[PDB]
Amino acid sequence: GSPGENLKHIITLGQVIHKRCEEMKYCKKQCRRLGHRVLGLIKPLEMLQDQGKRSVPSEKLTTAMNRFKAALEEANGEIEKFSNRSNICRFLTASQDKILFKDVNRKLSDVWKELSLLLQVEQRMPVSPISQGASWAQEDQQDADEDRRAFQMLRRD
């Protein structure tokens, strides 16, 4: 079953990244951006329900959100795997880019901006406070740039 309690799970899924990012060590510097950004997504959605009783618009919106809830599985899941030491180099060397959750963060912004329009019309929540609007990938590359360099010189674990 998926009662009202689910509302707390969906929002928690995105929060899990915040703590998961702390677990990392090497690429932890890069993931830090993914966890800080993702937090701003379920931030308003979490506090919302906190305001009063079960806060949720029409069911039609549930469908759009269903796509976002899964978006977290991508980041969270990836973090669990990346947690390893060799796995990091595996992708790093098997990817011209430097960021680990590059493609992941990409969809994250889409799943958010996709439901945002529905959230702004459904609920009185001021979406896109300031952090949104511009792709967070641009800045993500900066961190990954230096993060990748340091990785070059990593013998021990």
Ligand SMILES: CO[C@@H](c1ccc(C(C)C)cc1)c1nc2ccc(C(=O)O)cc2[nH]1
């Ligand atoms: C995936 O969508 C979630 C959801 C999560 C967060 C939000 C914030 C407040 C915008 C809104 C909606 C959701 N929609 C629902 C509709 C009905 C019921 C019900 O009790 O029958 C439960 C629901 N859960």
